[PDB]
Design a binder for this molecule. Structure first.
Ligand SMILES: O=c1cc(O)n([C@@H]2O[C@H](COP(=O)(O)O)[C@@H](O)[C@H]2O)c(=O)[nH]1
Ligand SMILES: O=c1cc(O)n([C@@H]2O[C@H](COP(=O)(O)O)[C@@H](O)[C@H]2O)c(=O)[nH]1
Lengths: 257, 257
């Protein structure tokens, strides 16, 4: 009884951020999230403008931007609104609730002011979600819980993954899905976003492992592929993004029937 | 066959950063780490200057400082050198190796340029340590692995904790100890630093749980207490720091015999 992204956008328990995302995925025929892993604001913004039509989401690591300013994020928001994609800051919050609330709202980055989505590790227990929610609920934001990781020797397996799923399902007012390698929740209101994706087999020299869009979306049942170097290191990043988009989209359609 | 901090500083396999720390702990009769959880640079620096003589370490969350600049960290280093304490940035790195290396070296914060110590979660597998090491070894830095957490519902238990200890013991050129609630390694070259510490029983409203210095150092065998609000929210932060210092030090001495 698998539903399209557009039908999932209308589910009774859908979060507004998830709904917005699912609708634009359906409209634009994309379930690709660009991992914009660059150190220069100009490159970030040039990528966001050129690839915006091809992506449902742009994932940032703001803490690697050498020339971060809040005005850069204002410019990114303009592009996100123009091309219709969400902004996801991959901060992987992983401390006690009292601390992560400050890390989310404050400091130099003011992440909550510009990020539609953030993510959190579940290792601290559910206080990490409660802390983030105190800032994110008033700001109408969503959160993803890291249920599995793509890297060699990941401990996010077995009962750890099951604990992530329970924590999500128990904080559905704020948690809209997962970072995972596969479908981990049976509830269709939750999004599954999967990093560690390339067309070719391989990995990197620091524990990253790759699987293909057909494997991740088609066989493992995830929703969205997150792709960094597969696109960013390519000469023509637009064509690379289109190849990943078409791969992930067709894998999704075939799983739908 | 328990050894003093000063003797542990001389162990054959001791890391240089651990040795420096252990020597100043012995010299100053302090095993207190101040968790300087403030949002203003002026308050951070006033705390570091006044409390510097009472502490072996000052722990930062640079990402909650509203007015962070690299010049603030230069001023903090001057104080750390004057009063003899290490600087520990509690960044809790928790991503793939390729990403954390950039988060450690680069961006606005340039953490590796000023932090003696950082910490990492073990959930991504050992690539998190390998990535950090590529930056930290050339810069003569050390790392702490998060083996246990103080918060309600922590998943850093059982085999997860055992995996943290193995990962530390296998990367002893860079990893100098743990964030933990107790002694988790039997090897005396490793430091144990414990947050979730207050004199009085209690917790916070976002999953923090407190135990006393006597419990953590004396009964659970940890080395250093990490104390934030117990000191920071007190009217007289200097006297508060002295109370925590004397508590942790005497608990240590009594465990020594
Ligand atoms: O399990 C995970 C969780 C992540 O955040 N990531 C992130 O997703 C991206 C993967 O990038 P790449 O496609 O270049 O390997 C990185 O930004 C990394 O930080 C991951 O690779 N695996
Ligand atoms: O398990 C852990 C790991 C932490 O980093 N911390 C950190 O240690 C400090 C505890 O501060 P406090 O004493 O105010 O509760 C915080 O900065 C928090 O981020 C913790 O409390 N428990």
């Amino acid at each position: 009884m698998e539903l399209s992204f557009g039908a999932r956008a209308e589910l009774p328990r859908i979060h507004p951020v998830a709904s917005k995302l699912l609708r634009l995925m359906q409209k634009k025929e994309t379930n690709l999230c660009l991992s914009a892993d660059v150190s220069l604001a100009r490159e970030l913004l040039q990528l966001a403008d050129a690839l915006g039509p091809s992506i449902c989401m742009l994932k940032t690591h703001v803490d690697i931007l050498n020339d971060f300013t809040l005005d850069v994020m204002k410019e990114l928001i303009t592009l996100a609104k123009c091309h219709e994609f969400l902004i996801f800051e991959d901060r992987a919050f992983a401390d006690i609730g009292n601390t992560v609330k400050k890390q989310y709202e404050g400091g130099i980055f003011k992440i909550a002011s510009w990020a539609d989505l953030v993510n959190a590790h579940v290792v601290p227990g559910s206080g990490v979600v409660k802390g983030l929610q105190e800032v994110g609920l008033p700001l109408h934001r969503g959160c993803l819980l890291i249920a599995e990781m793509s890297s060699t020797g990941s401990l996010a397996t077995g009962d750890y993954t099951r604990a992530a799923v329970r924590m999500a399902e128990e904080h559905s007012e704020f948690v809209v899905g997962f970072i995972s390698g596969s479908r981990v929740s049976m509830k269709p209101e939750f999004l599954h976003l999967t990093p560690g994706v390339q067309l070719e087999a391989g990995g990197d020299n620091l524990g990253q492992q790759y699987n293909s869009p057909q494997e991740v979306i088609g066989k493992r049942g995830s929703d969205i592929i997150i792709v960094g170097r597969g696109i960013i290191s390519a000469a023509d990043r637009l064509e690379a993004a289109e190849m990943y988009r078409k791969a992930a989209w067709e894998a999704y359609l075939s799983r739908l029937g």
